[PDB]
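Hi R.,

Here are the chain sequences for the assembly we discussed:
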Amino acid sequence: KIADYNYKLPDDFTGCVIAWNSNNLDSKVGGNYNYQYRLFRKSNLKPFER
Amino acid sequence: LVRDLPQGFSALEPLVDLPIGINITRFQTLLALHNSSSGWTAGAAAYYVG
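And here is the predicted structure of the full complex:
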């Protein structure tokens, strides 16, 4: 859902997805991490289009 | 010296990649041939597109 309505990767994506648990930063301490859009205008938002 | 683009064949070579993931639906070419010394007006120039 997070991909379809915000950021998609192509079917043949080549590379690496690196993620780590950031539980001691602004992410937990009074931050406002947002833009987690749940809807769409036409369809899935075309991979790599911003 | 010919009346129009002469019959013949040639090939082109690349310059840039410009990785900008945006939606382009339009295009405009502009050049100023307006001579302020006599008055501002379009000059004698043209181009081809396809």
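Residues 7 and 50 of chain A are 8 Å apart (CA to CA). Chain A touches chain B through three residues (CB under 8 Å).

Let me know if anything looks off.

Best,
T.
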